[PDB]
């Protein structure tokens, strides 16, 4: 195709041309993204023996990520040829895309996450680009994590050696610095006006997702809002429920807590921390297969624990993980018997176990309040969080209006 030819001249070597420069590489990735006939283009490049060449010559990992991601995401019936071509490319130089943030995804797996992700996004309706709504500049205190900030947890500097040490000794002044920032939840809400509350909510939802696979998307990455909508649809929730859960979490999250969240999960300890937007716990992600709707079974099976923890620091994966687990908790409650749950009926007299089976629009406000308890803690053990239900409930008010 036209795009095939352009790429052939950009990657082809001549007597006076022996490298695919950094700029020709960018021209190549641009040409792939802006192509109207991606499948034909690739078959062409395969026919010419230049498909393999393309993967070997676009060189620095960051560029190989864009290339690999754009081709994984845009190509339907040619995916295999592309994938084979890439495998065949990894001999000699098997480093590929497996550097930096992507250190835990084997290059071939990075391809596969990108392909599945682009499929999911189109099929579930979050492929479309999002206006670049503004993010907070906070770097400390409540609401300074990725929710407020758009700064991805895997992009945060490593915790200094002094601190990692005090953090191993369990020195509380330090465990503070790096744990949940709020104590009195009620007291915190008291400081926010109706407007400040609204502003946060908009800050959270209006941003493009902080994603690790930006180029799996046809254009710019979607708004979080778009992604929450899509996840609400899949799990019979509402995007306002989801946002309330997440805003609650992001209020009780700091930038340092994001750092600790991620780095403790991929360090030797392989910690079972709660990560990302919705504060999903690593083992729970795996145990309940929270990526089911974005990743094929084959791909998920191969995922290391540390890869899963990295995926949770990608906004779309965390949003879907959060939504699916909420629909889990609600479901688990529909099968419960309220008689055997005395303290629960005590704390939320209007609670309605049957209604949980369906949409949150037909839920009593006490179903949200109770689910809030049973999200920050063990689901339906008759042990309730005293302060989280009012805290999630407030955020829900802000989203409902």
């Amino acid at each position: 195709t036209a795009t095939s030819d352009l790429i052939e001249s950009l990657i082809s070597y001549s007597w006076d041309d022996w490298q695919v420069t950094r700029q020709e590489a960018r021209r190549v990735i641009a040409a792939i993204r802006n192509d109207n006939v991606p499948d034909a283009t690739i078959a062409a490049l395969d026919k010419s023996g230049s498909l393999i060449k393309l993967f070997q010559r676009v060189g620095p990992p960051e560029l190989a990520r864009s290339l690999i991601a754009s081709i994984a995401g845009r190509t339907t019936m040619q995916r295999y040829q592309a994938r084979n071509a890439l495998i065949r490319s990894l001999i000699n130089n098997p480093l590929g895309t497996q550097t930096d943030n992507w250190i835990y995804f084997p290059t071939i797996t990075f391809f596969d996450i990108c392909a599945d992700l682009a499929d999911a996004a189109g099929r579930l309706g979050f492929a479309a680009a999002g206006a670049t709504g503004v993010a907070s500049q906070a770097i400390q205190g409540p609401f300074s994590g990725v929710g407020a900030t758009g700064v991805n947890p895997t992009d945060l500097p490593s915790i200094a050696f002094g601190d990692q040490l005090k953090l191993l000794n369990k020195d509380p002044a330090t465990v503070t610095k790096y744990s949940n920032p709020l104590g009195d939840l009620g007291a915190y809400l008291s400081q926010l006006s109706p407007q400040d509350k609204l502003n946060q909510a908009q800050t959270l939802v209006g941003q493009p997702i902080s994603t690790l696979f930006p180029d799996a998307y046809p254009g710019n990455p979607p708004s979080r809002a778009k992604v929450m909508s899509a996840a609400a649809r899949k799990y019979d929730l509402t995007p306002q429920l989801i946002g309330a859960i997440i805003l609650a979490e992001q209020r009780d999250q700091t930038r340092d807590e994001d750092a600790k969240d991620y780095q403790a999960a991929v360090s030797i300890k392989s910690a079972n921390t709660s990560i990302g937007l919705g504060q999903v716990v690593v083992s729970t992600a795996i145990k309940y297969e929270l990526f089911t709707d974005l990743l094929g079974q084959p791909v998920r099976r191969g995922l290391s624990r540390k890869a899963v923890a990295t995926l949770l620091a990608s906004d779309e994966f965390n949003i879907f993980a959060t939504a699916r687990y909420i629909r889990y908790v609600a479901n688990l409650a529909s099968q419960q018997d309220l008689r055997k749950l005395p303290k629960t009926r005590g704390a939320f007299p209007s609670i309605d176990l049957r209604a949980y089976a369906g949409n949150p629009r037909n839920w009593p406000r006490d179903n949200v309040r109770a689910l809030a308890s049973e999200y920050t803690s063990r689901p339906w053990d008759d042990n309730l969080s005293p302060g989280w239900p009012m805290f999630v409930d407030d955020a829900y008010a802000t989203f409902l209006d």
Binding site: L185, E249, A271, N272, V281, S377
Partner: protein, 120 residues
């Protein structure tokens, strides 16, 4: 400051908790409307501990303990401490819970409550 049950149990109340005397002893819930509040519980009892449980010196005496861990939520896993020291022919028991994201909690408080408890 210093609670004295009618069955002999005398414990020191953890600073910052709601004291409330139960049947066999006391029950402390952490003050405030917190997301992840600590729940403590001292009581007296004639029976011995459940058969087989880790030991450890608790100051000048023994302590029979067990730490459970379960799935929780975004706040971490549920940790339940269960601890009993001999008070002569009887036993003082402490129970405790709290969520943690960062592995097993110290339970510093629950232990200082078992350690300082007495009968008479």
């Amino acid at each position: 400051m210093t609670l004295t049950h009618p069955n002999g149990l005398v414990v020191e109340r953890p600073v910052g908790f709601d004291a409330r005397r139960s049947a066999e002893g006391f029950r402390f819930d952490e003050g405030g409307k917190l997301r992840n509040p600590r729940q403590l519980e001292v009581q007296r009892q004639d029976a011995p501990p459940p058969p087989d449980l880790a030991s450890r010196r608790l100051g000048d005496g023994e302590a029979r303990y067990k730490v459970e861990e379960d799935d929780g939520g975004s706040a971490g896993s549920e940790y339940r401490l269960w601890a009993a020291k001999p008070a002569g022919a009887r036993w003082i028991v402490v129970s405790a819970s709290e969520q943690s994201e960062d592995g097993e909690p110290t339970f510093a408080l629950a232990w200082a409550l078992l350690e300082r408890a007495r009968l008479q």
